[PDB]
Amino acid sequence: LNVEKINGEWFSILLASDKREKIEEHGSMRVFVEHIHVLENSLAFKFHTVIDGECSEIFLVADKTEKAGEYSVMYDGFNTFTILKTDYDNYIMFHLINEKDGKTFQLMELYGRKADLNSDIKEKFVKLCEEHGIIKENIIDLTKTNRCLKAR
Ligand SMILES: CCCCCC(C)=O
Ligand SMILES: [Cl-]
Numbered sequence: 828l829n830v831e832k833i834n835g836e837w838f839s840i841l842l843a844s845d846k847r848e849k850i851e852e853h854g855s856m857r858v859f860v861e862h863i864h865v866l867e868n869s870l871a872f873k874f875h876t877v878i879d880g881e882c883s884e885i886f887l888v889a890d891k892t893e894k895a896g897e898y899s900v901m902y903d904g905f906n907t908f909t910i911l912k913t914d915y916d917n918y919i920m921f922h923l924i925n926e927k928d929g930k931t932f933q934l935m936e937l938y939g940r941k942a943d944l945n946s947d948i949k950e951k952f953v954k955l956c957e958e959h960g961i962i963k964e965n966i967i968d969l970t971k972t973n974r975c976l977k978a979r
């Protein structure tokens with residue numbers, strides 16, 4: 828992966844977890860990406876999220892860890908993530924593990940360079956989720972949600 832090539836603007840399209848509450852409407856992980864800035868040994872993210880019906884911003888910096896390809900960031904506990912698949916100019920898929928109180932759950936995210944992606948790419952993401960034990964019912968199509976696009 829040439830991580831520089833993931834720099835720039837992105838939109839959150841599909842959001843999936845094995846702990847569904849975390850990505851439901853008031854969940855901590857129901858966040859909508861606006862950009863990823865690639866720095867020397869980190870990735871700087873800007874998100875939106877909805878809190879009590881109002882759009883709000885979250886900025887996070889993830890550091891490279893000792894494992895190649897892996898990044899870590901503190902947000903509602905301790906997260907580690909990797910990039911699973913990308914073509915840089917259309918889609919990117921992330922896999923994240925959150926730890927809190929010694930318990931874990933997975934998040935998978937499909938982002939697009941535009942506000943939607945075609946059915947083929949979405950279906951591929953769905954099968955990758957399932958490969959990770961994230962069942963179809965636990966994958967949310969954020970294009971049918973408030974993604975705070977107007978705050979962008
Ligand atoms: C929301 C905490 C993790 C942020 C970075 C990713 C991969 O979404
Ligand atoms: Cl939550």
Ligand SMILES: [Cl-]
Nearest residue numbers: 973974975976
């Ligand atoms: Cl929206």
